[PDB]
Copies of this chain bind each other. A is one copy, B any other.
Amino acid sequence: GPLIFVEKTEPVGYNEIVNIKMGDGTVRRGQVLDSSADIVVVQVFFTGETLKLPASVDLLGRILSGSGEPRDGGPRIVPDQLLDINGAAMNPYARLPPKDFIQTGISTIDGTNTLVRGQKLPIFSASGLPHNEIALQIARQASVPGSESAFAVVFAAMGITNEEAQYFMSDFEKTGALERAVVFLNLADDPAVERIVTPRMALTAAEYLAYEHGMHVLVILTDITNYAEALRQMGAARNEVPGRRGYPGYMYTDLATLYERAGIVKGAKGSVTQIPILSMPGDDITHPIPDLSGYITEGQIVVARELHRKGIYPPINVLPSLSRLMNSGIGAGKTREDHKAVSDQMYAGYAEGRDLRGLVAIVGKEALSERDTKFLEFADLFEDKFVRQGRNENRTIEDTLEIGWQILTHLPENQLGRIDNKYIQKYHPAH
């Protein structure tokens, strides 16, 4: 059945039968699938012990490898608890829906596609686009305004270059973001099995901090596509083809062992939220991977080459973007009462303005009506002032709504069909 991860203490052969002492004290029998120098991947039905996260609140402030070993020149973590990493430890999750606001500081998320505590909200991108910049910005900026619970970030990078690792380390250290974060960095040339354990070490640390320490924890995982590229060559998957005889059953459910691990935790003081990065694979023909669409259930944030080529950062197109749980994190007592109306109106005006870019190409700028011209112009204002923000610019939701209201003044007040008159009088810059 399940895949588990084991401390290596001697060479093992493929399909070798082993006995494993679990974190809970019980014993399983299983078969070896693959190994690195220090880790064995075992499929459960030599005696070893499971690979463990050294769990402590002092994980915060540390930069570690995919297997949890120091990368920051500091001493190894002193454990409060030693936890199995596959998801079986703690049974932390409540049967409660995600809710309440996480302020990322980025208007195209907070404003129009709000991230909620306990949600999984992927960044959907492609090669050459600045998804890692967005991920690092959220790591530096995120908070839970008004919460009685402490906030932490777990940032996990998979298959990255030495240059990228050095950059991420420097960024966490210089900004002071490191103080509230645990960072796991897996390099391209680190063992494939270490890459596979990376998101499990990260999620286990997040669950520990959320459940045992009552924290709201935000987990940023980049790039799930790179995780999958290592998966698809590990163990029983090696040179097997998806949808064909010989392809192992566990390959169909592996991604779900990652995306199941999010939500409000028992007690409802804490939560685990995921922002996985999914880069569109450009090599489906030569490197088939597990379907990534399972990770996309609660919405997505879409990174658009059009906006990148216009020189806009962050190049997020709000129109194909969605948060499914947005309504659970906004409004009076969370953000502000006018949030939903303003988001609705900006979305509608921007979609109209973008269609009108097509109409301009069809009939010519001077053939466009006065009213249409205002919506055309609104789409430019939306991109130039609302979408566009600095790499270092952390906007409160109040800042975001204020920019929204300012650009909305470009539209005729009588064209604001999605904003009730109560909000126009209370919030419109002209009133």
- Which residue numbers of A lie inside 8 Å of B, CB to CB? 1-3, 22, 28, 44, 86-88, 126-128, 242-243, 249-250, 252-261, 280-286, 288-291, 293-294, 296-297, 300, 302, 304-306, 308-311, 317, 319-320, 322, 351, 354-365
Contact = CB atoms under 8 A, between A and B. Distances in A.
B356 A260 contact: yes
Contact of A280 (B1, B259, B289, B296): B289
Contact of A260 (B44, B86, B258, B359): B359
Contacts of A317: 291, 293-294
A255 B282 CA distance: 21
A117 to B, nearest CB: 17
Nearest to A256: B358
Contacts of A126: 284, 289
A44 B252 contact: no
B306 A293 contact: yes
Contact of A361 (B257, B309, B310, B357): B257
A361 B243 contact: no
A260 B1 contact: no
A293 B284 contact: no
A309 B242 contact: yes
Counted per complex, copies of this chain come to 2
A354 to B, nearest CB: 6
A87 B258 CA distance: 47
A223 to B, nearest CB: 15
A87 B362 contact: yes
Contacts of A310: 243, 252
A75 to B, nearest CB: 31
Given A306-B293, A306-B294, A320-B293, A2 B286 contact: no
B305 A260 contact: no
B284 A253 contact: no
Contacts of A291: 304-306, 309, 317
Contacts of A297: 319-320, 351, 354
Nearest to A305: B291
A67 B309 CA distance: 32
Contacts of A358: 87, 253, 255-261
B306 A319 contact: no
8 contacts: A2-B362, A243-B309, A260-B356, A282-B283, A291-B309, A296-B302, A297-B319, A297-B320
B354 A28 contact: no
B293 A304 contact: yes
A360 to B, nearest CB: 7
Contacts of A256: 354-355, 357-358, 361
A359 B258 CA distance: 9
A354 B293 CA distance: 12
Nearest to A292: B305
Nearest to A362: B87
B88 A252 contact: no
Contacts of A359: 87, 260
Contact of A305 (B86, B242, B304): B242
Question: Among the interface residues A87, A253, A293, which one has the most CB atoms of the partner chain B within 10 A?
Answer: A293
A284 B128 contact: yes
Given A2-B363, A256-B355, A284 B280 contact: yes
A33 to B, nearest CB: 14
Question: Among the interface residues A86, A283, A308, A359, which one has the most CB atoms of the partner chain B within 10 A?
Answer: A359
Given A126-B289, A252-B306, A88 B320 contact: no
Contacts of A254: 361
A357 B358 CA distance: 44
B283 A293 contact: no
B294 A3 contact: no
B243 A308 contact: yes
A249 B282 contact: no
